[PDB]
Amino acid sequence: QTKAPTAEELAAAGLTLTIDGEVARITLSRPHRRNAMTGRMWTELARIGHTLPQAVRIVVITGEGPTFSSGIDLDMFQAGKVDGEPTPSTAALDQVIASYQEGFLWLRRADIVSIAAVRGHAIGAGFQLALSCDIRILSDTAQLCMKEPALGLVPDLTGTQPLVELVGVNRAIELCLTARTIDAAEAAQLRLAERVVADAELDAAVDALVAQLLAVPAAAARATKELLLQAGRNDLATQARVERTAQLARLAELAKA
Amino acid sequence: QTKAPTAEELAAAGLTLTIDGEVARITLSRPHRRNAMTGRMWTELARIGHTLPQAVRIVVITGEGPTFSSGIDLDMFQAGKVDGEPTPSTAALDQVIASYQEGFLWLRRADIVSIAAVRGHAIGAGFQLALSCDIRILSDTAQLCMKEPALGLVPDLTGTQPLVELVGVNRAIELCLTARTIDAAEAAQLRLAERVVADAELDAAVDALVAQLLAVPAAAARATKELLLQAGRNDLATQARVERTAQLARLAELAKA
């Protein structure tokens, strides 16, 4: 919108947002349903993204309760409304899915560092939300599962690309085509978690990471993330040119100050 | 061909094929030569690929005996016929090598999951065959070696791309330009094996993986593999579009049933 979602509107969609200076914390807030996700949840995540204050540069996504997210609410695969919105002509459906994917795409923005702090299960859409973030910090209780193929579906919430980046195509095939669940130890071995900590220490681990990030100047953090996101698809000559162009802008700003 | 290779024809090329419903098992069957590969073997692997029944969605490649494959039969580097076929103008040679590479390229098909179950040495062409599969399960006896450069040759049986995907360019350079042999522990550390099991347990490990794969519906498995194979080279916007296009086709099929 132009208007940021209100706390009341977010509560109706199963979310909480708090902002403290440069840090925004989004909490999945349907513990009674193990933070199962709905269309409304996804479109409100997109609206949070589109309306975040310019000063926010770090976004932490957490769940309430012991489970990060059990994935799509199973009510979404029936006729009636969910979270007040009507569930899932082909063009229409395509537009709807695109609208949901917007809730995950913004987590890649160069001007934020997005962090998923995952306890318990992150299943399907929930795994994809965690994959969509820059960084994952897992509790030792975390369990990850790309469940969609077991349901007859593909992963369509933008998780395929980060999965392949993290684990390689071959392991991605094995995880997705078995739809198996992996524990935090395995997740760490496969580079799916940047850090694994004891459950009781997850909030402190997130806070420590946030403090490290805040200590690096915002503009250099943003420029560097933008460079890193381009590096895999550019040839080396091109990437060197992109790097130097970015450095010229940093030097120009530092000269102004 | 139109016609699948017969068991007799395959035996003359050093191979066995058995099909049981949705699963095909190809066994390299020259244990007396440590499953060294020949031109005939490669072109018959291509013909198996081209003629597989539509119902087959899983392909397991194994060796007979303690060695997966010692790589190219050293008789291939002389004048006389091998396996009845004449060994390796420049255009002709190029066509011949292309014909051999077809024996490995089909293992990437989206409609199959290919699994290499590797005991003992997988050298050169043998390593490349294992690399060409989606998944590798290694015995604790497995030893892998990209030998070609030590012989004055390059890897030309399609192994370079999967190697780089699995281990990264830098480690790939180190493994290939030293032509060193690595053991199963190292192979697991480097992501070259998805699983390492005791030698006596390799058949059971393959069966367990096959059972997991069969439990996921075929059409969703195929669509998801197709998505995963595209993810590395697409930008994120494009991959999101590809994902949603694939989901629309899944939803349309699920609606028909």
Place this chain on the structure above:
Amino acid sequence: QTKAPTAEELAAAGLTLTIDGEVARITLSRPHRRNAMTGRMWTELARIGHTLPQAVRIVVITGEGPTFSSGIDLDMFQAGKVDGEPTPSTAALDQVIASYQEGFLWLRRADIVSIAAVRGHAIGAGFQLALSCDIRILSDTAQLCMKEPALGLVPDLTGTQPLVELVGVNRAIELCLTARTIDAAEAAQLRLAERVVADAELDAAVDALVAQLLAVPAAAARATKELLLQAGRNDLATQARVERTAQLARLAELAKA
């Protein structure tokens, strides 16, 4: 130049070069400043690259003393000359940075295998130098840090691409946007080191790697490195074609001998 830099010229830039047959050893030689790098150092590294004898196929980069490199000399961020050269219109600056990046780009050449042998800290530009090499062998004393963002700068000495290749985009974001220091154990876990050895064993480990590399014929090593560098950005069909084209050239040369 046409002329290789002299030992005297290199000493003035903080470097030593020795060549013994097929192996060149470049040593960063300002231990009193912890091998901090300067513009002159970078441009002389480029000149070493451009003038290396054709017979050199292996390049080892080491530091004198306990620290590989503390990164850019802090004198480079002031008015006066450094190493006799004047420090860092926008076009001019762009040309200057491009000239420095040439000191790192040549380490990717297909006709060499470049090896960084790292003790102690490799910070910023120093980390990027190590990243620019094909292979890193670390002492157990090694500490790596992408410091630039903490200084308000981006990494612009060509390190972004190898970093992302080695560790994946997500971990690269975490390392760069925290500007944190990692130890050799972590570096090994993240694939930043191909090998980690005890400090006293680093020279022997480098020598052992050099011996393995020399045992593989030069032309096959060069062709294979060239193939590996292309594999990530090519589709599989294309890479198979590139591989076979390269094999035809190997077979033609082997037939001549």
